[PDB]
Amino acid sequence: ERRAVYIGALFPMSGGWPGGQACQPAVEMALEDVNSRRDILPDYELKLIHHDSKCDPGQATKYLYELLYNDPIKIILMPGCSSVSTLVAEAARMWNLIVLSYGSSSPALSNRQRFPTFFRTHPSATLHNPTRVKLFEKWGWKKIATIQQTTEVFTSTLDDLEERVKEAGIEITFRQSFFSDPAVPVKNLKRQDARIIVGLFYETEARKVFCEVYKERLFGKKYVWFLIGWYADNWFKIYDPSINCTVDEMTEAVEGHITTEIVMLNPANTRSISNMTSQEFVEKLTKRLKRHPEETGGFQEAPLAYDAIWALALALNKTSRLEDFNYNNQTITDQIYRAMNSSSFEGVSGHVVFDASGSRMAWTLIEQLQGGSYKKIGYYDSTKDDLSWSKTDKWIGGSPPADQTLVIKTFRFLSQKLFISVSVLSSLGIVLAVVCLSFNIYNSHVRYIQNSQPNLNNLTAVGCSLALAAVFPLGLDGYHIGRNQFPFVCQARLWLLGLGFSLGYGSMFTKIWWVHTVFTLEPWKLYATVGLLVGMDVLTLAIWQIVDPLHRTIETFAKEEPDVSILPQLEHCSSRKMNTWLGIFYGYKGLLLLLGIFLAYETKSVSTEKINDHRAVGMAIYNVAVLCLITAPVTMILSSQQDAAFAFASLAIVFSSYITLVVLFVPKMRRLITRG
Amino acid sequence: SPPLSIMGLMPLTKEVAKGSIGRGVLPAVELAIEQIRNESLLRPYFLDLRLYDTECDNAKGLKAFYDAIKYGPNHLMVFGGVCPSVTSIIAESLQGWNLVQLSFAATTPVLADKKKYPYFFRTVPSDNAVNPAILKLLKHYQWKRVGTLTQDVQRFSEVRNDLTGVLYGEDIEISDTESFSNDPCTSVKKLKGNDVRIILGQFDQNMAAKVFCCAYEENMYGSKYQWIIPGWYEPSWWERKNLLAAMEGYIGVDFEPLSSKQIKTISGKTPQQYEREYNNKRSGVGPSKFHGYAYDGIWVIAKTLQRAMETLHASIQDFNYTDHTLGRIILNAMNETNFFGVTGQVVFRNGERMGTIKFTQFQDSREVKVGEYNAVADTLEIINDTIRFQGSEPPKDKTIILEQLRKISLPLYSILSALTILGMIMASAFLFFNIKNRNQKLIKMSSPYMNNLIILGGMLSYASIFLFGLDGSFVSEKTFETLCTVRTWILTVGYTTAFGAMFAKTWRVHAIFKNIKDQKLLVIVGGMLLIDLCILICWQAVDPLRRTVEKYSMEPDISIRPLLEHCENTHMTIWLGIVYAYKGLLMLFGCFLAWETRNVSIPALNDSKYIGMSVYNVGIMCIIGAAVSFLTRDQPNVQFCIVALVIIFCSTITLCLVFVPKLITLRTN
Numbered sequence A: 001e002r003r004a005v006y007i008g009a010l011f012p013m014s015g016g017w018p019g020g021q022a023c024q025p026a027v028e029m030a031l032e033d034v035n036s037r038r039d040i041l042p043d044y045e046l047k048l049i050h051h052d053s054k055c056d057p058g059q060a061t062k063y064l065y066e067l068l069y070n071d072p073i074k075i076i077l078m079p080g081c082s083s084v085s086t087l088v089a090e091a092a093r094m095w096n097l098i099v100l101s102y103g104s105s106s107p108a109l110s111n112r113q114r115f116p117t118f119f120r121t122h123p124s125a126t127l128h129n130p131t132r133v134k135l136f137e138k139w140g141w142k143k144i145a146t147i148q149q150t151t152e153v154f155t156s157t158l159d160d161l162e163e164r165v166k167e168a169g170i171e172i173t174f175r176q177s178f179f180s181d182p183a184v185p186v187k188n189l190k191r192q193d194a195r196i197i198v199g200l201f202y203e204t205e206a207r208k209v210f211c212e213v214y215k216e217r218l219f220g221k222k223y224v225w226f227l228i229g230w231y232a233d234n235w236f237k238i239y240d241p242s243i244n245c246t247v248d249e250m251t252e253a254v255e256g257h258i259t260t261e262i263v264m265l266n267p268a269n270t271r272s273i274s275n276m277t278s279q280e281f282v283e284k285l286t287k288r289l290k291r292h293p294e295e296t297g298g299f300q301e302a303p304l305a306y307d308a309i310w311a312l313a314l315a316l317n318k319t320s321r322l323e324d325f326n327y328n329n330q331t332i333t334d335q336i337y338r339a340m341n342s343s344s345f346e347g348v349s350g351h352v353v354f355d356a357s358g359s360r361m362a363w364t365l366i367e368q369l370q371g372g373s374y375k376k377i378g379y380y381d382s383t384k385d386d387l388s389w390s391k392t393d394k395w396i397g398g399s400p401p402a403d404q405t406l407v408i409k410t411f412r413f414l415s416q417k418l419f420i421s422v423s424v425l426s427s428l429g430i431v432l433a434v435v436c437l438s439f440n441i442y443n444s445h446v447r448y449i450q451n452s453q454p455n456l457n458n459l460t461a462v463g464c465s466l467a468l469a470a471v472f473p474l475g476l477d478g479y480h481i482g483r484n485q486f487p488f489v490c491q492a493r494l495w496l497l498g499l500g501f502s503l504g505y506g507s508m509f510t511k512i513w514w515v516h517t518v519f520t521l522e523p524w525k526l527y528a529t530v531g532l533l534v535g536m537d538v539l540t541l542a543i544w545q546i547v548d549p550l551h552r553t554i555e556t557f558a559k560e561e562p563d564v565s566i567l568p569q570l571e572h573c574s575s576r577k578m579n580t581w582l583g584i585f586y587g588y589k590g591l592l593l594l595l596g597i598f599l600a601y602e603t604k605s606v607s608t609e610k611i612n613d614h615r616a617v618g619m620a621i622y623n624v625a626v627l628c629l630i631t632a633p634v635t636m637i638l639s640s641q642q643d644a645a646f647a648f649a650s651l652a653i654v655f656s657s658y659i660t661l662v663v664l665f666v667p668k669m670r671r672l673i674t675r676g
Numbered sequence B: 001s002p003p004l005s006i007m008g009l010m011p012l013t014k015e016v017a018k019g020s021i022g023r024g025v026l027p028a029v030e031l032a033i034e035q036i037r038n039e040s041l042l043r044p045y046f047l048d049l050r051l052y053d054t055e056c057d058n059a060k061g062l063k064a065f066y067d068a069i070k071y072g073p074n075h076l077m078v079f080g081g082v083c084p085s086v087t088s089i090i091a092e093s094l095q096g097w098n099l100v101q102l103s104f105a106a107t108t109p110v111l112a113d114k115k116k117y118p119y120f121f122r123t124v125p126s127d128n129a130v131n132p133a134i135l136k137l138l139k140h141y142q143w144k145r146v147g148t149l150t151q152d153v154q155r156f157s158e159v160r161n162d163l164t165g166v167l168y169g170e171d172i173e174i175s176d177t178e179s180f181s182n183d184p185c186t187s188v189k190k191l192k193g194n195d196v197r198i199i200l201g202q203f204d205q206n207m208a209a210k211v212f213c214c215a216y217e218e219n220m221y222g223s224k225y226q227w228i229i230p231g232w233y234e235p236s237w238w239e240r241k242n243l244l245a246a247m248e249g250y251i252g253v254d255f256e257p258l259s260s261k262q263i264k265t266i267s268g269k270t271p272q273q274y275e276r277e278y279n280n281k282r283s284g285v286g287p288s289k290f291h292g293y294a295y296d297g298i299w300v301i302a303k304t305l306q307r308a309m310e311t312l313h314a315s316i317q318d319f320n321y322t323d324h325t326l327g328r329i330i331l332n333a334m335n336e337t338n339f340f341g342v343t344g345q346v347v348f349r350n351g352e353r354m355g356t357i358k359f360t361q362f363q364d365s366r367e368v369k370v371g372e373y374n375a376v377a378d379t380l381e382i383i384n385d386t387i388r389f390q391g392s393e394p395p396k397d398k399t400i401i402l403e404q405l406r407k408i409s410l411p412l413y414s415i416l417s418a419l420t421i422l423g424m425i426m427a428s429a430f431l432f433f434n435i436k437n438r439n440q441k442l443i444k445m446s447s448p449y450m451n452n453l454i455i456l457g458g459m460l461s462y463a464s465i466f467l468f469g470l471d472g473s474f475v476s477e478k479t480f481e482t483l484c485t486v487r488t489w490i491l492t493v494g495y496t497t498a499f500g501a502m503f504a505k506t507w508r509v510h511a512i513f514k515n516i517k518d519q520k521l522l523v524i525v526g527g528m529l530l531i532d533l534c535i536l537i538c539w540q541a542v543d544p545l546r547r548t549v550e551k552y553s554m555e556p557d558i559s560i561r562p563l564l565e566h567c568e569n570t571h572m573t574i575w576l577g578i579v580y581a582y583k584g585l586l587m588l589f590g591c592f593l594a595w596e597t598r599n600v601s602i603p604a605l606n607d608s609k610y611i612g613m614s615v616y617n618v619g620i621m622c623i624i625g626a627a628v629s630f631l632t633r634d635q636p637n638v639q640f641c642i643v644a645l646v647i648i649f650c651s652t653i654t655l656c657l658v659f660v661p662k663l664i665t666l667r668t669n
């Protein structure tokens, strides 16, 4: 005779998950197979008492009373669902019992302060997230978005995902919930232009949200959808009278969407403890059903009912002592806890080992949709950071997109050919200036030249030469300069132009001034008049450079297109509040430049000694004023452009210089050469 | 006699913190049972209540229920259940044993789901009965806008999600909604920014102090803010000064433990007698605010048990739990009960009770009751001379907007319009004096008509000042839109003619000094006038200036936002710049000639020096006027007066310096 040992179980057969249609025969077969062999339990037989629960906690407590207060005496309790396991695990503490569930996948049952005697085989739903993040890392993504139907499982899952992703240098953006209105939450995605998406929900939520998607055009080449895998293939080719979209309209919205999954059957064909192969087990239990294994329920979960009742026997063999078990003593249960806590073996589902919180770890699987059919991509074992790719992925753009459109900044420059000729003409100008200065300084003892002021003419030539030179640093930017030697150019421009202009106009004006004055001429007085104007100009320039220096100022205008956006940036050597300085320096000069013209139009015919060239000076002053007046406003209004603001300011200086130096110096040669 | 048994579930130990609720109500049950026995209402049978502890623990609760089902006698009903974790477990497992339950201390809304809990009745109202009272407190006082603060827990969300559902038919509209978990001050700031004065709070004891402190720090309190929050806290929870100043003026809501009305109830007593009986029955056991509901529960259970025993005789000692008919009988019997009790009249609208809510207000020391709202009648009752406000009117959820124009005040407009007549009379006098001596030699030497033109220009300019002032509700809105054009035309012509003449004369002088007469001057003046005439025609024909309104200020009890009007057009910078530049250049040119010809001159023209001085004065006057115009456009009153003074001096000193010598020379000779 063998001393019996009873256990109690609750199997569902209707509701939201009928997983007892196919999990009762498996456990019966396991029991008979383990009782046959005489190497595990020689003098201890096993037997089972089962009840129905319908996966609701209303019947479960009634049956738990019917099963816990009437003889015989039970040892181990096995609940199926996740809504009637919580209850029994909370309650059994007062009866000193063990519970071993084969179908509950809720992250809340992983605590150890409320559930201290709970073990299970079906892993949790916090086992996709490591895969998800280890896959994000592989493809360089740092901005994610998510949405979730309302339920506890999905909420806890997303919380764990956030905790795991906020610890590897990644950030989340958006979290939108709903119950049955997927219209506004999916419409509010385009408002933020989110592209990488993870979706947690059931099948009907899918068949609805995806029609909403197709309407809102949220798919293409820059959109990736992450989903869950236990949906049944062909879940988009099924009639939906509550849906307006069609089959071909939606089959184009669910193209190329990843999906994870958990694996329960050993993909290999290796033998196990019971000397059985997966193929010798599927058919073996399919020969024991009424309907077909595709129309019944809870078929893919039986291996976890088989591979559980074996752990029990394995851990109970060691202890070997059981005919006297009262619900009060708490030492036998502790022994069994220590035995089950040290489990390691191979079964139809693989290597089963229980972690600290009762749950077990397993390998997970990845897939992808390629033309109305799923095609595997790889596995993953979260225990040894392992992986096994296949090189079978696919993309529309030969590569996967990234989180957001990168913006590249471009720089505009001159033509690089309009500068060379204009910088060359300056050399000819300076050559003419030197030639003329030499021709005027060679002869220095003739009365013809002693009459007309030689020093003033030379000063004018020097001023014009400096002005011509100042043209170089005006075009030098970019290709021929960096971010360090930039300020050295602006100072050059300013200190050359603002010096040469005044150093020429001083003479070219003071001569006519003193002439018209005597017309109403000691040489000493004339020098003071010229020196005064230049002395004043330097004061304004130095006070500007002292209390207001110019360093740089970028200008960011419209961003032109080419998934890359280019925004072009300009580079103005400017300062703060330059408008006032420019207005001041332009008006203070326009005054003189508009007065000298009238003074010259006055003394048109007056004749004097040592004032012979007055007409030539008048013509020179006439040209200069018009050119300067026209050029200054145009240049000020064209600060945006880069080519125009160079022509209208480089031609108007060479023209003036040339027409000036070939007017009051040509007749001298034309005469002194023809008259020896 | 044959007993009738009843099951009881409530905490009894002292380690649990809720044991007080199971110890402060037993006296009432003892009284009720004593009375039921004395009165002899169940002739053969009597009651027998049984006590069982749970410790408010899920496991410790099931074991007691089970032990009772096994050892104890054949029970017929369940009575009690204060903690929501274990009663929500027990309420789903009754259709199998065919029992009925009656809770008097569970205030959770979930138990209203009659799909899972069909055999559950209670008396104490739920926490989702406060909103139909808040509604009729808002309506009475004519309020429309609201600000709701939610805490991130399901206890409070269960009612935050029920509030938004009853306001559908009504007109109230939710303006804002802020949620918080630990940091409420960010939400308090986000609310204060929206400028709301109505707050509907839902939070526990400490977060109340937190939010009050951060609101005081945000200055979200005063005679323009109202507080609404729960009122089931404990006294002295504040256990500084500033806090008490931000708290006063808040309204709390709870349920009425014991009615004040005096009427004969079903036990032959009155709420004021039972209060004394109870307060004298318990000596050491502390007070609990739920006894009025236990007392009524006992009586309702007795009444329904009797009404059911009646129908049974027309067809009770051996009731195995497999009796479906008896359970249905009792259930259908309990749905037909209505009487009067210490708490009010008891009725059951699908389990939930229809009871009385009560408001309360805090006045510098504690909360005092105000109004009682009776659900079964939908009538709200208030007491006067006890409620108070910070102001003398019911605050509203908005701010008043005022639009002052800033127009002139007219203490000085009349003065200036009067002073403007001195110039006109002087000009008329001078014109007549010049017209009288049109034959003498003095008048014949100097220019004949240039002076006349100058005087006409002065008078025309004088009109411009009259035109400047009309604005700010002086004339019809359709007039202001037609005066700017005539104003600018008149002022343009007035400045044109006079200076044209004053410049042509100096031109003739300077020309004679270097090397008909009266005709060429007129011709050049006409040309100068033609330029401005063409310019003005072009402008008045292309895009006239329209009246634009500007609003810029915040002066706070209604807020006032002032408004002003500007006669401008979009493209004003180019027009103004061109006109100003053209007039300035001419003035400078004219001024230079006068200085050059200070001493030199030509005979037959004696007014050279004086005209030069006039030119200088006019130039400086116009420059100052133009500068002042751009600087004081915001302030409209000072600009007007200063510009008027400038115009007067400019156009008067000229004449006073030209004609005066030619007049005293005749007066003396």
Ligand SMILES: *[C@@H]1O[C@H](CO)[C@@H](O)[C@H](O[C@@H]2O[C@H](CO)[C@@H](O)[C@H](O)[C@H]2NC(C)=O)[C@H]1NC(C)=O
Pocket (backbone or CB within 6 Å): B332, B335, B336
């Ligand atoms: C339960 O009691 C309530 C309160 O009187 C009652 O509303 C339920 O049905 C009332 O039943 C009447 C017929 O007996 C019916 O005419 C009446 O319309 C109905 N009440 C309402 C609001 O419609 C009662 N239900 C039962 C006794 O099963």
Ligand SMILES: *[C@@H]1O[C@H](CO)[C@@H](O[C@@H]2O[C@H](CO)[C@@H](O)[C@H](O)[C@H]2NC(C)=O)[C@H](O)[C@H]1NC(C)=O
Pocket (backbone or CB within 6 Å): A275
């Ligand atoms: C496990 O099963 C295998 C095959 O199912 C057994 O090896 C077979 O064992 C039988 C023993 O009766 C031999 O007659 C066959 O020759 C074997 N077949 C092959 C292909 O090797 C093995 O003995 C079993 N192990 C046990 C029962 O411990």
Ligand SMILES: C[C@H](NC[C@H](O)CP(=O)(O)Cc1ccccc1)c1ccc(Cl)c(Cl)c1
Pocket (backbone or CB within 6 Å): A016, A017, A081, A082, A083, A103, A104, A105, A106, A122, A230
């Ligand atoms: C793999 C997973 N295992 C099932 C859990 O074991 C049941 P659960 O209680 O944990 C959550 C639950 C799920 C559905 C309906 C009610 C409840 C699963 C999930 C859904 C389906 Cl459709 C299938 Cl085939 C398989």
Ligand SMILES: *[C@@H]1O[C@H](CO)[C@@H](O)[C@H](O)[C@H]1NC(C)=O
Pocket (backbone or CB within 6 Å): A039, A040, A317, A318
């Ligand atoms: C069961 O226990 C016995 C004795 O400890 C041992 O010999 C046997 O190998 C065990 N069975 C298994 C399957 O480990």
Ligand SMILES: *[C@@H]1O[C@H](CO)[C@@H](O)[C@H](O)[C@H]1NC(C)=O
Pocket (backbone or CB within 6 Å): A341, A342
């Ligand atoms: C058994 O579980 C305890 C905690 O429950 C743990 O400390 C111990 O390491 C486990 N035993 C083994 C062999 O892992």
Ligand SMILES: [Mg+2]
Pocket (backbone or CB within 6 Å): A229, A230, A231, A232, A233, A261
């Ligand atoms: Mg699949």
